[PDB]
Amino acid sequence: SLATSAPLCCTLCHERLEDTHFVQCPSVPSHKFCFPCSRQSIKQQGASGEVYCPSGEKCPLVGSNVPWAFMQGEIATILA
């Protein structure tokens, strides 16, 4: 077993999130967001039509040149 992995921290609020369900930016390993911070990003970005990386840096989908966006099902899980 394991008591805990090495510490990993929310990019925006600095809270520990290793070994939890959190949002991992596909193309930037250090971009990690807890669900509370992600909820804020979804609400603030939602009016544009798409929700991109909560860092605001429009990080790409891996292998592509366009920013990755949340899926509807992920928004549902995060807002639950």
């Binding site: 939890t20 369900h21 959190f22 949002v23 991992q24 930016c25 596909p26 989908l61 891996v62 990755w68 949340f70 899926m71 099902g73 992920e74 899980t77 995060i78």
Partner: peptide, 6 residues
């Protein structure tokens, strides 16, 4: 992509 939710 896989889900962004870990």
């Amino acid at each position: 992509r896989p889900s962004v939710i870990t």
